[PDB]
Design a protein around this ligand. Sequence first.
Ligand SMILES: Cc1cn([C@H]2C[C@H](O)[C@@H](COP(=O)(O)O)O2)c(=O)[nH]c1=O
Ligand SMILES: [Cl-]
Ligand SMILES: [Cl-]
Ligand SMILES: [Cl-]
Ligand SMILES: [Cl-]
Ligand SMILES: [Mg+2]
Ligand SMILES: [Mg+2]
Ligand SMILES: [Tb+3]
Length: 289
Amino acid sequence: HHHHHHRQYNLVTRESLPQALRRIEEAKRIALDTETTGLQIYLPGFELVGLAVAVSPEEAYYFPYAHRDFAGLRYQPENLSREDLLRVLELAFQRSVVYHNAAYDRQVLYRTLGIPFERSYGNDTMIALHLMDENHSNSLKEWSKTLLGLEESMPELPSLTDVELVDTRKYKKKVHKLAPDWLDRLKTAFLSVHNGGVSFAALHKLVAQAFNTLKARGILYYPGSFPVDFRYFHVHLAHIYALDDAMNTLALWEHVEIFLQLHPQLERLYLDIELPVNDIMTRASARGV
Ligand SMILES: Cc1cn([C@H]2C[C@H](O)[C@@H](COP(=O)(O)O)O2)c(=O)[nH]c1=O
Ligand SMILES: [Cl-]
Ligand SMILES: [Cl-]
Ligand SMILES: [Cl-]
Ligand SMILES: [Cl-]
Ligand SMILES: [Mg+2]
Ligand SMILES: [Mg+2]
Ligand SMILES: [Tb+3]
């Protein structure tokens, strides 16, 4: 685990899974966010990579499911099993659930884990916030800046290699070696711009920059460019990104229930029309629109 400015980020492992279940079980309201291989849920090869679960706006659990190590480096933790994630989801759905874009997450959970839409149903900050400000962007990062007061951030990577002089004519050649602490150096570059709501593009820029710097120094080789694939994003960085989405969604929900209490006209519009219609459209895409 890691505490970064009032927020507790927990990376779940097989060992720490029972504590994560104890914290979810204790929560009256949770937020769910899915991390995946792309925006198209119905493309062959689509996968759920990890699940973010916030038990409060300052406490969350990341459940790695299909993360992988890229270009021969060793940095990912051990992924949790399908049964482990289904235990998490059985527990999660026994309390109130909040999403930011429930149509995406619920279709991901159905397609990849077979979670019925009946259990999946929950609140959606993206729908309720559209009733607060119709002209505002649907982006969770953008709404976090507006209501939660997150600072603007739109990544300067340190040297991940140490130069060693190696006896080789009769001279000393400069050979770059991967620094033993390269992961802590990479986390430091990430933390120096971490505002509590770092964007996907920014996370990918740093991850890509990390691998490209190592490829440009002969440390590793991969054919082509660095893929826009969350499976390869270093979990010790990516779990912070994913967990902030879950914590921002729950923090935004606190603001939403205040707004809906002051406007029961919009609360009724949200509960009787918006959320049910969105559920209808979500189930229809899962069959084929
Ligand atoms: C924001 C974004 C997300 N995605 C995919 C990967 C993410 O793991 C998944 C969930 O997005 P999220 O980070 O907003 O929850 O959607 C993209 O493929 N491109 C994007 O620009
Ligand atoms: Cl895609
Ligand atoms: Cl695996
Ligand atoms: Cl169903
Ligand atoms: Cl040389
Ligand atoms: Mg999401
Ligand atoms: Mg996310
Ligand atoms: Tb309420």
